RNA sequence: GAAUCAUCGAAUCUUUGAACGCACUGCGCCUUAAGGCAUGCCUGUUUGAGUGUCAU
RNA sequence: AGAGCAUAGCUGUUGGGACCCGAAAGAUGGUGAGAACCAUCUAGUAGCUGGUUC
RNA sequence: AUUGGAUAUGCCAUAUAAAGCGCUUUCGAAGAGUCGAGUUGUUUGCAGCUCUAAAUGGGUGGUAUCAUCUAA
RNA sequence: UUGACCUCAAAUCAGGUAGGACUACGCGCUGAACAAUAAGCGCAGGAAAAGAAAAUAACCAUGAUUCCCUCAGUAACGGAGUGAAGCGGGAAAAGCUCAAAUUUGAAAUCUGGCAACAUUUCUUUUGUUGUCCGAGUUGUAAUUUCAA
């Protein structure tokens, strides 16, 4: 084994940028919430925003 | 405010200017005391065994002879044609006096 | 692994352990006191810097710049004059105010003549008259150091003040 | 014969402490000297501006900086570069009276000996 | 000054006065040892303009090597070694024949309170400039290993400089 | 004031080894058991010599 | 009336010890007494031999 | 307990001094067995050998005169 | 005879310094097979080396060095292979000291001894002042480094 194996990989910016979207959009939806493993059965709204 | 567009461009209008000469330019002027010194140590120092053949060629005419010593002994043309003229000016000071 | 860092394994003597290891930690201001007063120890210098008030580069930015929320001919040059610039923040006004102060403190820039001064320039005044300064340089006998007009012309202003 | 980069995060925040750590020195005054604005010498790019490495003698003069003073307010100065042009003269003496219009130079303090 | 005509005496190397002076004192260092103290330079402009002083904790050497690597270079490394508590500023040549090249070597001593305290020489006291002439940190030895500045004067291409993100 | 403890600025640190009085423990020298006694080089000090050059 | 650029995977291919293993080179520097022995260059090699995993 | 750079404030300050910027009916020194030429090797550089310079000279470039630089 | 100077000496005279070790990273002198490599030899430091143009360029010109990216696997050499550099973009930026011109109305310069006075990372370290001797006119200071 070598250390100049190639450890880091290059994305698109832009990509990179789209799965951010594509992820935030995804936590708005309480069914991937729960198929993700998070007991939101009983907060009151999807998205949850509270104060400042 | 103090800053640097460092992009393109900064106007097509130009015009030239007139600049001085730097001191380092003045390199190889001669001074005067220089050339002095430089005649009394040539005076005082005697003349190399090739300058002897060279100055004892130039008297009895040979000028072809002289250039051709100097040139091998020197090297290049230019060398040999100052060396020429400096050992005529020392033969015809000398000629003038002894 | 090397026989010298088995050598110390080995030993039954402690190790000479330093701690100095904290990264994110940034240098503390010395120098200046109004900029220590007012700096935000968590801060970078370049936003420190900008919240003070001051330029921490006078040329150009080698990359982008962070933006945190979303904001809404030669005669002419060689002789105009600039008048300054304003003070932005309050702590810019204090460094301004303070400049001021202390040039206006430490400003006395006449020198008093001494005792040899004063005995020089009487002696060459009461002969050559008071206006004529270039007979006076040109004395030999009462101008032994051979100063010229301008000193002389100076060490006559400084004799008045 | 292999060269790494596994230190370029470790370069980038030690370059960083060093700014902060000379800024922690002068604290005040930028972490950088003034540069002139140059045209690159090719027939590529001599219509772009960049920073020069100092101001000329020629510069200086006209907006009335000396040349033994100007280091001392963090205006460098090349003996080399020389003007041309009028507009490089003109381009570059602007941007030293700028600078010195947004100048605050601190007084120092002076011996003054009580006789003459 | 009178630096000025010796410096252009120099120049006729092999006048009358130059060849007559070089063969009488060739004689004479082959006399002496190879490696011998000078009790002052024998070319006092050319040490001068090579930054000797006379003053105390400046050292003259003389030194022949037979002709037939560079000859100065060699002269300052051997010198070096002889006296190895002082610090070899430069050298210049003063003599040749047939079989030998004489040169002169000019060393400091950087223990001596006349060098410590002279900023002018004070940079030569540092750990660092031991042994110059050994790390070809001379004047001959910067010119035997090509350091110029120039177009008339290898790792770092060897090497594949594989970055993180590639 | 315990410590097979920590810190650590003071003392001690056998014979060797660049290894240094000569061999390599003997064999020595000088001075007052102790102090010492390697080599090269640099600055100075002191004592000498020279048919060296000059002055009286 | 432009179709490319970037990244990832796959496959092929060319180099690097380059699927693994198998013959002594030669050279440099030493040890012991021509020859011998030791350590590194050096993963210098096998047109091939043997092997190569659900 | 050690020390950094500053600040403020005393006491001294050998200033009959020392600097920057104006001006010129006055001056302006610049590194040699080195550059270079020829010939042998190593690799244009370096070195040996024979010879050996110049003062608006010398080096290096674009001209194929101009530009740039000021080595030992 | 004595003295000045020079030269050669000597001294267990006083005060200093060199060697050896480690060498991952410096820089040198070398040097095979197959690489300007290994090995050999020499010399350093916390970095070393390099460094304020006898540098580029041919432009509206740039401006010490070093390093990174790019130039570019390009030009060139020699088809293969070897393989840069100027520009450009970054990191960091800092500039200077002498030789060569008479201080000549004043060797203005420096080491050492001795004696005091301080001072300390420190009774261990550093100096200052005074005096004497020495160095130095075959040149030690101030002044100047071509950018002038």
Redesign the interface.
Known sequence: TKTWRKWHVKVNQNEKRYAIASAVAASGVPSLLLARGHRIEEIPEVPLVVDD | APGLVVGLNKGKTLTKRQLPERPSRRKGHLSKRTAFVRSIVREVAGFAPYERRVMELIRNSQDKRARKLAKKRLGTLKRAKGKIEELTSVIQSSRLAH | ANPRQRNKQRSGKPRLTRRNAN?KA???????F???QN?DKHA??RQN?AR?G???????VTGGVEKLYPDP??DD??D?E????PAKTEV?RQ??E??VK??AR?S?KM????????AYIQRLINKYGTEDFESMAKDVKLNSKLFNGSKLKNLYI?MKA | YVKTWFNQPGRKLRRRQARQTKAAKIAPRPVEAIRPAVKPPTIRYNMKVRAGRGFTLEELKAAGVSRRVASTIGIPVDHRRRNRSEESLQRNVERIKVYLAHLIVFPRKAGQPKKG | GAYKYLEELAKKKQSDVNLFLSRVRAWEYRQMNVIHRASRPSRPDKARRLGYKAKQGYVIYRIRVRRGRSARCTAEERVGRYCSNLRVLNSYWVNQDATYKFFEVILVDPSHKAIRRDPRINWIVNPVHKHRESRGLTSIGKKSRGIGKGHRFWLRHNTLSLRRYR
């Open positions: 990264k940034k240098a503390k201001i010395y120098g200046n109004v900029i220590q700096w970078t210098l810097y003070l001051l330029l921490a580069t006078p040329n150009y001919t030669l040059v060689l105009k600039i008048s300054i610039a810019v460094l301004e303070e400049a202390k040039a430490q006395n020198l008093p003549l001494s005792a040899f001064e004063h400084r």
